[PDB]
Design a protein around this ligand. Structure first.
Ligand code: MG
Lengths: 138, 185, 136, 224, 386
RNA sequence: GUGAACAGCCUCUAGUUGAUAGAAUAAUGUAGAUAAGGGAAGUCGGCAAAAUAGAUCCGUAACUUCGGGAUAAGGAUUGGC
RNA sequence: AUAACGAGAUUCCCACUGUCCCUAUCUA
RNA sequence: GCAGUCAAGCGACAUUGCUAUGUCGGCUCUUCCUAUCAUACCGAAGCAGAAUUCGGUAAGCGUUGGAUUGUUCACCCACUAAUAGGGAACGUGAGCUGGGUUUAGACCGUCGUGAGACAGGUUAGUACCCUACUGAUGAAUGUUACCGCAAUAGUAAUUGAACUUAGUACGAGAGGAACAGUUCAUUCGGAUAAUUGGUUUUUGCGGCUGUCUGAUCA
RNA sequence: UGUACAACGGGGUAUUGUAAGCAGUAGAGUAGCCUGUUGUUACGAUCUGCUGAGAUUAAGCCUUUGUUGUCUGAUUUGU
């Protein structure tokens, strides 16, 4: 078994889902669902589509580089399948997932910080410019 | 392979029975293998298709009595024709006993006309076919087909020359005698 | 299955019916193949014989070196270009449908094969895999 | 020299790979093919029932020597794990992300020298050189692009397809630093690389191999 | 006239007439051989279809080219909550076939089966078993007489069981009564075992098990009045044929002067009871065990139920049986599971099905995540979070 | 108004709400469409459908009664600011 | 007594397409 | 067949030389016959194996896609185990096709003084009634409801490949099998949306053109 | 007259694709005042941040610790 990352969205592609394309260049492209496959068939650029992870990574909407992401790699060199190592990896994956979620939440908070001041300023502008409405209200 | 069938072979025997003499009207291009405006006993005309049977009948009457066309499929049946109420003229449909260079098979229905371009090239010298179009000193006859297609503007979508159509037209013109050729005695 | 097959054939979607044109994938000089019939297919009323990846078909070369034209020889399809069910659980399809020409014994006319070669064809035909520089 | 057969395929090289320290065979069919190697190899070197990308052509999808083994991208993680477990640490296993997955056909190599398809990028060439620890050169046998299918090599000698020219034979012999002979296998089959598998002390070919072919194989490989 | 061509007849003639089934419950026709050398056990079970899902199984089929490979395939999920015995039937052989001797009911019955005996239940006084319950007690004799009569003359014993509909997400609220023949020990042992189970519940793992082969019997999907083209697969006429083109043109010859019954006329399609055999059970689930959809090759503590629930069906929440292939009938439909009915010994039956991974992605669309945790990890925090 | 146009569509002045209708969307029909791979292998027969369609620029063959073929054929562009 | 032109008769090539392989869906 | 040959009976078997004047055809459909092409089971053949010939019962199944005839005449390519022969008004016009035949116009050849005809070739042509069948309601059975038996009618599976047997028996060589066990596929039949393909009136979500609501939004 | 039913609302799962509005030292370029040589103030398709935002969600998707409403309308049946 192997979950594949969508070429157009990087989303996990579980077995028996989506469509795969093989070109004369002797490489394979996997699409999670028909939407991504149709978008690719139109020669669209994922970096210019807002609903694909490529744009978010390029646009900086989410943490693009982090230390946690270094754990996940294509292990071209296998391991001898030690029983203790299996349990250690099982615990480490959960710990890394929790840490990555915390870091992503922190990054989102840092990106969204300051919206409160803008909202307060907009409310002040709306209140100041509508005296008659307030007078009629009370 | 075409130009023969039971319904076609039957007519030959019918005209032979209905005719008392047969005269050679075979093509003059290959003696070893007649126009309207220029040139009771039943005489039957025997020969391959596109040999001159219909044209020879028409020129005798000085009018287009019989249908004449380059296509071998002139007619599957014969009819009686008379001149001066002296001799009866009967022309059998062309029968080829058990090809494309001869007026036998229509070039339209052939799926692979390109391979016959070397055949026509063999019959005629370089200059004789060059004088027909005079486009280049061609070599690699496929290149000759492409050159003729470009000269005549016979190109498919994208810009590729129409090799099949150009070859078909070349063979059709060869059937008309546009490119002179003859068999040495 | 015809001679040269070393195992059972998987059930895959029919891509090339009779008369379908498939590009060549060998250095034999041919460029396109015209399918006239499919070997091992059970003919039924109104049902045009159709091939698929790894199938052996009889075809006549339409374009390429004239020496190979007008003659019918067995051909093996290397690319289908129609989605088929792979047991690994992926609906994969190839960019262009293509085939190769080989004798009934399975020996490849061309010394080598160009472009990707389907897994279901290389696995079933040892000669195709040996003469194919790319699989999948 | 020993005669054997796959289920019914005489191309032993397609369904098996043999080296000086390990052997690989297809899992499909029965154990008759597996037992044939045991009669000659016994338990001296490992014999692994392994598949590559779900195919039985593992002999042509993978290439390697006693120092390392290479597999294409299509190989699943399960196959890589099984190969790692079933082979000693002295035999390296390295996944290859090259465009041409036909490692067995693209790469023809022995314990000292290797030949690769020129289209292979220099990165994969360096990876092959480092993992296998052998000299790697871009060469073809008289225009035969697939060196791994039209050539067989070993520390004792090598064999190429008959169409190889005398000049090509001399050049390849000089490059590989081993004797080479142009001949056929499996009763005139020109695909020598895929027809049979050979090592420094054991050559296995299909039943169709004629007596002159077996004698030539034994003489060139110095098996007796 | 030999018509110059031979073609197979369109549609199997054995599945006629193609009429609607008389009940949504597909009654079982034949039970297994009923060899009395084995312990008493049930022969069938009742379940409700709960959609389907995909499975990846490490095929170990020897000889096959998929041996030791990984193959993805479809599996159907049927909601099979525990079943409760509510009576027994004693059958006595007669020259005119099997005949029902007498029926004995339990001491008390749940409202689910009492509801099955009324069509205006909300208006009903609910007098289901007012006197029968009174007859059961105060002597312990009237029922015992029926039990003795059954023991004396019965030949095959059938247990009256009904599904716990209230446990299922269905809003039906009505149970389905069914007769299940008792196999195993002698008829006296059969009735003794059934008697001890009065008012009790029977699980599903005691009847079926992993790797077991079962036969699916249920009513197929209804489609109403259908044209012959789809009803029997008749080929369409070329185009714009007079008086229609989607119908069989020639119906019969002058002699005979009547329309042959086999000329495949148009009519009702679907809703016909069908029987399928050789269905291998892939997994037996329990509602009290967490991680029902987990596997030794997955480790994920997730239920088989897809994200957001099934389509047109609720959450399993009970015991379920996983079976490969497709089962007749649509979702939330009552389907009866029956044994193979014969001593199957094919290697497929002997095969052991150890699932590698179970698909629990949402069936509501192009699902990309197996559990909400994966979706949260991928998409991350959203605006609504803060 | 758009558009070369009284081509096609919307709007102002002016004039109409007249064609028995309520519920459902069974088969089969009438009118109009979409479809993975092949692209006529169907049929007596390319029957029907489809495909190019306006404008700007390059280019345009055989024949010819030199007036035509010709918008031959085949190619590049079309929005907004 | 043969150019152009044609709701004239027939053959063939490119594009094309549910005529077909094999039918399926929608709208009034 | 012609002209002989001998001869059990009242002339059998054997025996001598040579030797198209019509329109029916095709797409779908159901059923029936064996005079068996293929499949099951057997006997005889120089059957050593392999392959093949004939013969016996057996009709369940299967008996095709194409170059090509309007065609009655009827010939070829390829797959497949094989591509067997027939009937039901040589079934099937209120089923279709009018393809061909056959009105009213017109063109070419023969004759006919003429109108016209053909030995002839071409062109264009106007069920809503009853029953049967497929589906579907229904009064009377003391009422309703549930669970059951089955008189009866129909009936289905079909065929080839792949591993082991085994390069083993057989065989001088060439080559080359049984059985049993195991794995797929061809045709057909019953289901079903798990995955993928297809449909968009979810007019669900976005963009595009003309026009209109003063502009934005809508 | 209660794990009772129905209309909404809250979540889960999906479809599409970043809504109105605000601000920008992004924005090819063209103009008033001025006096540069990042002048400033105006027009400016687009782009940037709020904003994986906005909208729909069953008419045949799952759930509902909430709000509101409903629960005696006619006929027939006898050994
Ligand atoms: Mg003529």
């Amino acid at each position: 078994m192997r979950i594949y990352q969508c070429h157009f969205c990087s989303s996990p592609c579980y077995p028996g889902h989506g469509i795969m394309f093989v070109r004369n260049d002797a490489k394979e492209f996997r699409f999670c669902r028909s939407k991504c496959h149709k978008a690719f068939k139109q020669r669209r650029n994922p970096r210019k589509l807002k609903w694909t992870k490529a744009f978010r990574k390029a646009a900086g909407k989410e943490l693009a580089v982090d230390s946690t992401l270094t754990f996940a790699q294509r292990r071209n060199v296998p391991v001898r399948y030690n029983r203790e190592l299996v349990a250690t990896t099982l615990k480490a994956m959960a710990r890394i997932e929790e840490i990555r979620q915390k870091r992503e939440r922190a990054f989102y908070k840092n990106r969204m910080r300051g919206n409160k001041e803008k909202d307060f300023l907009r409310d002040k502008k709306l209140v100041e410019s509508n005296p008659e409405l307030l007078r009629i209200r009370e | 392979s075409k130009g023969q069938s039971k319904r076609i072979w039957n007519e030959l025997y019918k005209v032979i029975d209905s005719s008392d003499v047969v005269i050679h009207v075979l093509d003059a291009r290959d003696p070893l293998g007649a126009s309207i405006t220029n040139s009771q006993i039943s005489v039957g005309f025997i020969g391959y298709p596109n040999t001159g049977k219909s044209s020879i009948i028409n020129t005798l009457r000085k009018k287009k009595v019989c249908q004449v066309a380059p296509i071998p499929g002139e007619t599957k049946v014969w009819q009686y024709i008379t001149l001066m109420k002296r001799i009866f003229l009967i022309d059998c449909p062309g029968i080829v006993p058990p090809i494309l260079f001869r007026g036998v098979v229509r070039v339209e229905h052939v799926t692979h006309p390109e391979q016959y371009i070397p055949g026509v090239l063999k019959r005629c010298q370089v200059k004789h076919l060059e004088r027909t179009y005079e486009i280049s000193g061609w070599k690699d006859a496929t290149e000759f087909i492409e050159i003729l297609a470009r000269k005549q503007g016979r190109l498919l979508k994208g810009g590729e020359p129409d090799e099949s159509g150009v070859s078909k037209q070349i063979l059709n013109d060869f059937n008309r005698g546009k490119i002179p050729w003859f068999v040495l005695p | 299955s015809g001679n040269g097959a070393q195992g059972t054939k998987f059930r895959i979607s029919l891509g090339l019916p009779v008369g379908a044109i498939m590009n060549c994938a060998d250095n034999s000089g041919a460029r396109n193949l015209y399918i006239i019939a499919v070997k091992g297919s059970g003919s039924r009323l109104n049902r045009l014989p159709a091939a698929s990846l790894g199938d052996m078909v009889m075809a006549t070369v339409k374009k390429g070196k004239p020496e190979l034209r007008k003659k019918v020889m067995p051909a093996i399809v290397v690319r289908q270009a129609k989605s088929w069910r792979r047991r690994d659980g992926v609906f994969l399809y190839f960019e262009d449908n293509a085939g190769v020409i080989a004798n009934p014994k399975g020996e490849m006319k061309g010394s080598a094969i160009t472009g990707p070669v389907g897994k279901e064809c290389a696995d079933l035909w040892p000669r195709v895999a040996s003469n194919s520089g790319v699989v999948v | 020299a020993t005669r054997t057969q796959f289920e019914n395929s005489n191309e032993i090289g397609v369904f098996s790979k043999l080296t000086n320290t390990y052997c690989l065979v297809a899992v499909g069919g029965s154990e008759n093919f597996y037992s044939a190697f045991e009669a000659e190899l016994g338990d001296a070197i490992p014999i692994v029932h392994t598949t590559i990308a779900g195919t039985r052509i593992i002999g042509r999808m993978t290439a390697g020597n006693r120092r390392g083994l290479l597999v294409p991208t299509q190989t699943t993680d399960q196959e890589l794990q099984h190969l790692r477990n079933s082979l000693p640490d002295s035999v390296k296993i390295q996944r290859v992300e090259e465009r041409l997955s036909a490692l067995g056909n693209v790469i023809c190599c022995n314990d000292y020298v290797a030949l690769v398809h020129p289209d292979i990028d220099r990165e994969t060439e360096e990876l092959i050189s480092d993992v296998l620890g052998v000299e790697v050169f871009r060469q073809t046998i008289s225009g035969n692009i697939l060196v791994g299918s039209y050539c067989s090599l070993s520390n004792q000698g090598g064999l190429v397809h008959p169409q190889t020219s005398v000049q090509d034979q001399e050049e390849l012999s000089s490059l590989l630093q081993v004797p080479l002979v142009a001949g056929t296998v499996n009763r005139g089959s020109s695909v020598v690389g895929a027809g049979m598998v050979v090592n420094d002390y054991l050559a296995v070919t299909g039943l169709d191999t004629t007596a002159p072919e077996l004698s030539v194989i034994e003489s060139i490989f110095r098996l007796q | 006239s030999h018509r110059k061509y031979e073609a197979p007849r369109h549609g199997h003639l054995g599945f006629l007439p193609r009429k609607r089934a008389a009940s949504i419950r597909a009654r079982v026709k034949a039970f297994p051989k009923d060899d009395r050398s084995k312990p008493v056990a049930l022969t069938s079970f009742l379940g409700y279809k709960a959609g389907m899902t995909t499975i990846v199984r490490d095929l170990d089929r020897p000889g096959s080219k998929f041996h030791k490979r990984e193959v993805v395939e479809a599996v159907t999920v049927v909601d099979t909550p525990p079943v409760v015995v509510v009576g027994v039937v004693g059958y006595v052989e007669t020259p005119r076939g099997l005949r029902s001797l007498t029926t004995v009911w339990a001491e008390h019955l749940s409202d689910e089966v009492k509801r099955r005996f009324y069509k205006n239940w909300y208006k009903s006084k609910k007098k289901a078993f007012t006197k029968y319950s009174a007859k059961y007690a105060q002597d312990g004799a009237g029922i015992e007489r029926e039990l003795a009569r059954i023991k004396k003359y019965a030949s095959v014993v059938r247990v009256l069981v009904h599904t716990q509909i209230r446990k299922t997400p269905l809003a039906q609220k009505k149970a389905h009564l069914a007769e299940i023949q008792l196999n195993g020990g002698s008829i006296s042992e059969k009735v003794d075992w059934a008697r001890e189970h009065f008012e009790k519940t029977v699980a599903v793992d005691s009847v079926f098990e992993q790797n077991e082969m079962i036969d699916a019997i249920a009513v197929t999907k209804g489609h109403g009045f259908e044209g012959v083209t789809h009803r029997w697969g008749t080929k369409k006429l070329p185009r714009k044929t007079h008086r229609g083109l989607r119908k069989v043109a020639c119906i019969g010859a002058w002699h005979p002067a009547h329309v042959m019954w086999s000329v495949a006329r148009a009519g009702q399609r679907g809703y016909h009871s069908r029987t399928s055999i050789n269905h291998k059970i892939y997994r037996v689930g329990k509602g009290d065990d967490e991680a029902n959809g987990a596997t030794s090759f997955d480790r994920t503590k997730k239920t088989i139920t897809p994200m957001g629930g099934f389509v047109h069906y609720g959450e399993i929440k009970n015991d379920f049986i996983m079976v490969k292939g497709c089962i007749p009938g649509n979702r939330k439909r009552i389907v009866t599971l029956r044994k193979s009915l014969y001593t199957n010994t094919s290697r497929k039956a002997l095969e052991e099905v150890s699932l590698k991974w179970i698909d629990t992605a949402s069936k509501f669309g192009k699902g990309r995540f197996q559990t909400p945790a994966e979706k949260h990890a991928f998409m991350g925090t959203l605006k609504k979070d803060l």
